[PDB]
Design a protein around this ligand. Structure first.
Ligand SMILES: [Br-]
Ligand SMILES: [Br-]
Ligand SMILES: [Br-]
Ligand SMILES: [Br-]
Ligand SMILES: [Br-]
Ligand SMILES: [Br-]
Ligand SMILES: [Br-]
Ligand SMILES: [Br-]
Ligand SMILES: [Br-]
Ligand SMILES: [Br-]
Ligand SMILES: [Br-]
Ligand SMILES: [Br-]
Ligand SMILES: [Br-]
Ligand SMILES: [Br-]
Ligand SMILES: [Br-]
Ligand SMILES: [Br-]
Ligand SMILES: [Br-]
Ligand SMILES: [Br-]
Ligand SMILES: [Br-]
Ligand SMILES: [Br-]
Ligand SMILES: [Br-]
Ligand SMILES: [Br-]
Ligand SMILES: [Br-]
Ligand SMILES: [Br-]
Ligand SMILES: [Br-]
Lengths: 255, 285
């Protein structure tokens, strides 16, 4: 019976629109606070969702932690610009503690980071994070942006994830990307959808560190204007079907 | 206790935010979890009855009749059907009639009832003349045969007029309802058109206030809750002739419903660039 309480908590999270998810969980623990069996079930479920979806967790003023597979370290999460691993609570979405590998990779990682921030800063400027992660050996660039119409009403989530792995170390590179976008209508929060665009582009670079970053950042800017074009024709298409189905509601014969 | 109030806050929040088409499923899941608790069974019943009243829900009555649930029909804990002269006891979770208490009929109706009867007849005629019938919900230029079981619409329509008397001032509430179903039981839309006039017999001018609510609730196989509303407030010239009074009110309703048709037929999709961030993806010209 206590087992049946678990399956429906999942269903509660399944279809709910994104802007509303935070609220419900907050109360779900308070609802089931004495049941440690479903409390551990909840801690498990939220960490996955939060990791699956690149949740932004704010730290101090003007920083963000990105919760995902790629930043996970043990059960903590890496912020590469600072040299810090963070312990977080997934339910509340806040940081609760902080405790701080080729030498050359780091400065390729950095240069991508700095031109990444410059790009987001001019054109994205609402929650907006950008970070570059480095790891048989590739670099990961990431822009996250959550827009709200007002207060807590979700307008969009933009997740743009880019990985490049090097055999040809200095002359030609492979850059793969995924842009995941979630949008909810202000007119109706039950009208919402997710779309995903994949890219696999080859880029020319030199032994120059920053041209390596600038060339990659030139590709992202263009791939992102591309997805955007697709999206604005998907919105208008949907909006237009909404109008068409709404006019079918009029019960009068149509003159 | 503290939890009882937090369980309520949660039940309220989920039923508040749920689109109409998920409410029933949502309630059922709430009962399995909290079903032994008669306080929250009753809390849920209260919340749903008010919800039902807020949405001019239709409950089928006998063959081909409907009770309409809303403030204006409320009588005690019952609901009036003004033409049959029946108070209906309803189950709000089940959306069914569970008892009826007939009113004693009057050999002679007083004058208010004569206004109500006249407004009732013109309201029904109006729907008859101007609302789509079966061949008009057809997806064709012309009325043809509907092909296959699944293909087609089920449409449920109801209208009613209610009368009350507040300190010798009269009041009439006129109401039209249509609900469209895809397949047979997927609720697609509601149309709710509601009209009040508060007036004296001697008045030659009345104020007719109205509200027209259009809600799309099925869209690309999802339950949604896309609402459009237009409110109206019209001065109408009338006389002591009761039937002409009904015709004048009905002429304004005819025009206001035409005005919404025009509005809906001139909505377009916004093609601004900031669409993702744009509060208005649907706009008029
Ligand atoms: Br939202
Ligand atoms: Br950042
Ligand atoms: Br954006
Ligand atoms: Br909404
Ligand atoms: Br209709
Ligand atoms: Br409450
Ligand atoms: Br309970
Ligand atoms: Br019955
Ligand atoms: Br009556
Ligand atoms: Br009636
Ligand atoms: Br029941
Ligand atoms: Br009866
Ligand atoms: Br009577
Ligand atoms: Br008449
Ligand atoms: Br009826
Ligand atoms: Br009718
Ligand atoms: Br549809
Ligand atoms: Br759905
Ligand atoms: Br309004
Ligand atoms: Br008006
Ligand atoms: Br108007
Ligand atoms: Br007169
Ligand atoms: Br008369
Ligand atoms: Br008019
Ligand atoms: Br028109």
């Amino acid at each position: 019976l206590l087992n049946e309480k678990k399956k429906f908590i999942r269903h509660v999270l399944s279809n709910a629109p994104p802007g509303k998810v935070f609220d419900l969980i907050s109360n779900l623990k308070t609802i089931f606070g004495s049941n440690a069996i479903i409390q551990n079930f909840i801690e498990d479920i939220i960490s996955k969702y939060n990791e699956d979806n690149y949740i932004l967790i704010p730290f101090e003023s003007d920083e963000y932690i990105i919760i995902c597979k790629e930043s996970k370290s043990g059960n903590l999460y890496l912020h590469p610009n600072l040299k810090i691993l963070a312990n977080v609570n997934h339910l509340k979405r806040k940081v609760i503690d902080t405790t701080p590998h080729p030498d050359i990779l780091e400065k390729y990682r950095v240069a991508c980071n700095n031109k990444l921030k410059e790009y987001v800063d001019i054109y994205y400027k609402v929650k907006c994070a950008s970070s570059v992660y480095a790891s048989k050996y590739n670099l990961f660039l990431l822009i996250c942006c959550d827009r709200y119409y007002l207060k807590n009403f979700h307008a969009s989530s933009w997740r743009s994830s880019w990985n490049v792995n090097f055999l040809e170390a200095d002359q030609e590179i492979i850059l793969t990307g995924t842009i995941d976008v979630v949008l909810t209508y202000f007119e109706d929060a039950n009208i919402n959808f997710k779309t995903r665009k994949v890219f696999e582009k080859r880029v020319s670079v030199t032994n120059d560190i920053e041209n390596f970053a600038s060339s990659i950042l030139s590709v992202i800017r263009e791939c992102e204007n591309d997805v955007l074009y697709d999206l604005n024709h998907l919105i208008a298409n949907t909006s237009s079907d909404l109008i068409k189905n709404t006019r079918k509601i009029i019960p009068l014969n149509a003159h």
